[PDB]
Write a protein that binds this ligand. Structure first.
Ligand SMILES: [Cl-]
Ligand SMILES: [Cl-]
Ligand SMILES: [Cl-]
Ligand SMILES: [Cl-]
Lengths: 349, 349
């Protein structure tokens, strides 16, 4: 019962963010939640094209890198390309059919779109620094370490999408499908959404920031500077994206938007804390992979793992979760130079 | 029959460089070979003290280096310290008792002295960048790779010294020592000297220049810059030292100084070519050791081995030997910035 133009004239200011009447009119003169309208406007104001950035001198730098420094750089680039391949499509496929207010629907489409620009930018970098991009793009799918991350991350989306389809096709209840039981529960579907959004928040707010530290470590060395110009633009967008999901999560758990979500967010608080901790442990294990053949000036496994803990505590606090790690100061304060924009706070605070 | 003041009033302008009457009067108003007087004057004009150089910021750089870059740096430093531990004492112990003209005798003492300043400078660097210098100094003696080089290099000196003592004690002839035959031959002793000087030429002209490339590669990266200031001073001295032995070798083989040496140099020309080639192969194997855990920006095994071939051809040509390697251009032209002085040509030409 998904409908691309629902016929009921409903008050869009009183719909929940999710699971209400699907959005009919796209109107932008009023919002339930003006954060999403502000995010659209910012993201539109940031519009950039990757070919705006000259990455010519990055091919020379990359060829000069010792083999383990190529390994750090190219592994980081492949991981980012994986993540925004997923982020390109997934917010649209997974969330659009669930959204019941226009500002959020348009934010999600704007968000996903901005991710396709990131993917396009990773292609621009790749084709400029290697002789055969196919090798790189194929390794994104087959690489043992990258695949493990792809599998976990994609499962949050995939499960929400499948359950969403059952909800739209069958509605709430207990059902018979080819002689087996299928229980469709809005409460469970709400839990799937909440976890998926927690996972997407950890992806943009933690996993990509770990990756930024790697890119900007090269830039600190005055290497791969075209790459770094692009990552500055990407990071400025990412700051919006993670703000968007922090607001979605916080509005859902407060009870303001849907009192039932408040109880659901409370039920699965341990599951969320665990998902976040798991993501952080995975980014630390990724550090171990990046640096398994040696580190470089200014960044190694120990430093990068401290940064994982530092940023994870900040991001978890922002969505109301307990801190998993000891308090610590920023282990790499130089990163804040690269994570700065006049029109949004790009660095964690 | 070594005498510290020989009583015969001899014409010092007609003595050979070596094996003549030991020098009585040290006079500097005339020379047989004014190259040696020019070298003394230059070396005196270059006099420096290692504490003139601030190496404080090298401790911070060294601590920031990844472990394999520490390995490159500290292995290179240990090898240099080994070489000038030997060069500090060895020219004096091995050549002074053989010298029969005053300008050469004083050049050798000035040379050896300048080497003690180099050793003192390596102590200055070591104690400033590590917490426990004893570990470093002990590893110079025990390190498998360094010891192999020490053994070969020291043998050229040690054999000349032993034979020299037999010559001084027993003179030319066939002798009985504790019931065995000892043949003392001036011709063989002359051959020992010539080979030893060929070995010392390869040491200063090739082995130390390979090492300079390593030091200056860090400086190109703006790392270990105090070390590099010291190496610039050391390299300026080394240019004199190798000039000194190029002249000794060339004057000996031309017949000008001792017609018999000319025939001896011709006899053992293959042995010299082989010694040089061996030294070069050893410096290439050393490159393989330096970079066994990874290389760094601007210098790796392949580049350093090209530089070994490039400099070896130049140095071998300068002492009349055939070139072992294909013609090639300087693989690291940036090194010539560091190897430059207004008052001597420091870089190979
Ligand atoms: Cl307005
Ligand atoms: Cl809270
Ligand atoms: Cl004069
Ligand atoms: Cl010649």
């Amino acid at each position: 019962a998904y409908t691309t133009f629902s016929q009921t004239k409903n008050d869009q200011l009183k719909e929940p963010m999710f699971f209400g009447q699907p959005v009919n009119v796209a109107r932008y003169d009023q919002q339930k939640y003006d954060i999403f309208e502000k995010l659209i406007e910012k993201q539109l104001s940031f519009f950039w094209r990757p070919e705006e950035v000259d990455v010519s001198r990055d091919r020379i730098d990359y060829q000069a890198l010792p083999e383990h420094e190529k390994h750090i750089f190219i592994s980081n680039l492949k991981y980012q390309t994986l993540l925004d391949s997923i982020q390109g499509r997934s917010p649209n496929v997974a969330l659009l059919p669930l959204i019941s207010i226009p500002e959020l629907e348009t934010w999600v489409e704007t968000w996903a779109f901005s991710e396709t620009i990131h993917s396009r930018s990773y292609t621009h970098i790749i084709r400029n620094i290697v002789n055969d991009p196919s090798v790189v793009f194929d390794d994104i799918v087959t690489n043992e370490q990258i695949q493990k991350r792809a599998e976990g991350i994609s499962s949050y989306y995939d499960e929400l999408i499948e359950m969403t389809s059952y909800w739209h096709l069958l509605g709430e209840g207990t059902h018979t499908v080819n002689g087996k039981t299928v229980t469709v529960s809005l409460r469970e579907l709400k839990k799937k959404l909440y976890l998926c959004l927690m996972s997407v928040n950890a992806l943009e707010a933690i996993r990509f920031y770990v990756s930024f530290a790697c890119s900007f470590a090269f830039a600190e060395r005055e290497l791969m500077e075209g790459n770094a110009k692009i990552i500055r633009l990407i990071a400025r967008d990412e700051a919006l994206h993670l703000t968007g999901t922090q607001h979605m999560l916080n509005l859902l758990r407060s009870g303001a938007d849907d009192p039932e979500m408040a109880e659901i967010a409370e039920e699965c608080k341990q599951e969320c804390y665990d998902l976040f901790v798991q993501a952080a442990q995975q980014e630390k294990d990724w550090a171990d992979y990046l640096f398994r053949d040696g580190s470089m000036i200014g960044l190694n496994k120990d430093i990068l793992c401290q940064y994982v803990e530092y940023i994870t505590n900040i991001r978890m606090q922002a969505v109301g979760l307990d801190l998993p790690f000891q308090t610590r100061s920023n282990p790499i304060p130089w990163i804040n130079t690269w994570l700065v924009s006049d029109n949004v706070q790009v660095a964690p605070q």
